[PDB]
Amino acid sequence: NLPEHWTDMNHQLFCMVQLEPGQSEYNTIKDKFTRTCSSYAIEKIERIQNAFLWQSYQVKKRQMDIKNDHKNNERLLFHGTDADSVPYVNQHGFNRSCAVSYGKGTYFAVDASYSAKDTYSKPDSNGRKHMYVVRVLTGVFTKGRAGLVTPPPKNPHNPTDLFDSVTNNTRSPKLFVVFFDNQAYPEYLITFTA
Amino acid sequence: LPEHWTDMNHQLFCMVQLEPGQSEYNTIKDKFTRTCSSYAIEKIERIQNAFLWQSYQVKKRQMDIKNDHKNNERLLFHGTDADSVPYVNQHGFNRSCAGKNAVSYGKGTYFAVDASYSAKDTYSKPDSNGRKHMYVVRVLTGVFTKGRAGLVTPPPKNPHNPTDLFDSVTNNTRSPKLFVVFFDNQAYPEYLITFTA
Ligand SMILES: NC(=O)c1ccc(OCC2CCCC2)cc1
């Protein structure tokens, strides 16, 4: 069930598609980034077409939509990473096993400006920085804390019925942490400079 | 969902107690007694977890596509403590919760070929009533190599293509006795064996 806005992959299961600047898709993703990163220069935006990651992610989304008994489980967030991690994330997505104040999960920022920090989007031996735009199944969330390996339970009387993610601040979240594979789909890769 | 599962009436999860004398019970008992003849089985439960099954079967279809005509799936054992059983039944095998193995071939979830390995008190810790717990697990071993203690994912097949990974690792490729998996939904807890001395 590969999305309509994907372009043909000649029967292959993975490709990185460079977006055409000035077209609707590129402009939408650039706007999300320039909301907080207008001083950064975008070299390119690539659409990540990873059939297997998409499949696994969409299954988790359908499950979370059933479990939570409503949609609105998905947020579009940012993830800065070093150039050496980009091939892995493109192919395999996010891996909690690869500061973790809110738990031992994968971190995503609400604002590109946070992911744009050199500590996350480390400039490569050419000044280029890399940030993903990520579909994240945040679902029902709670405040995180150091040392979590999964989200807390919604009620400790049922210790296996878990929150879907944690955040720094439930009323005004700026980051989300997920603890399971295939809760996040890297949808675009932005290559940019300071 | 498999057509021989009990009707769960829209419910997403059930444990089904098997009957001795049914082929399904007897095959698991025989697989267990092959190496654990000194222990006695209290009961065997079939684990019907719709979401874990769906996610696992997606991963299996993907590995079946990627590997072409490999037997990607092995039926293996996993001993665990009573405290972990409710979590595994609902959520499967989380590498983030895994103990360090006495012989480490990587930081992942360990599965044994022989029930005797999983039957060690270090894995199937007897509970306060002397009950030991072992899962029988469909594991996507895929294409595997000898692991190494440092691993947090399986190693690449080719050092010049670091993202094209083995599916799992083992202690010995010639004579595998354990497999380690490093990803969620690569192992489906199919049966829970409750047993005693
Ligand atoms: N890679 C990223 O984009 C990213 C990394 C870390 C992120 O929050 C880290 C928390 C904020 C302060 C304490 C820990 C968010 C995003």
UniProtKB/Swiss-Prot annotation, chain A:
Location relative to the cell: Nucleus
Biological-process GO terms, alphabetical: negative regulation of gene expression; negative regulation of transcription by RNA polymerase II; protein poly-ADP-ribosylation
Keywords: Glycosyltransferase, NAD, Nucleotidyltransferase, Nucleus, Repeat, Transcription, Transcription regulation, Transferase
Transmembrane portions of the chain: none
Keyword Lipoprotein set for record: no
Source organism superkingdom: Eukaryota
Domain PARP catalytic: 2-194
Gene Ontology molecular function: NAD+ binding; NAD+ poly-ADP-ribosyltransferase activity; NAD+-protein mono-ADP-ribosyltransferase activity; NAD+-protein-aspartate ADP-ribosyltransferase activity; NAD+-protein-glutamate ADP-ribosyltransferase activity; nucleotidyltransferase activity; transcription corepressor activity
Reported effect, residue 80 to A: Slightly reduces catalytic activity. Abolishes activity
Principal location: nucleus
Gene Ontology terms: cellular component: cytoplasm; nucleus
Cysteine disulfide links: none
Function: Mono-ADP-ribosyltransferase that mediates mono-ADP-ribosylation of target proteins. Acts as a negative regulator of transcription.
Family label: Belongs to the ARTD/PARP family.
Protein name as it appears in the record: Protein mono-ADP-ribosyltransferase PARP15
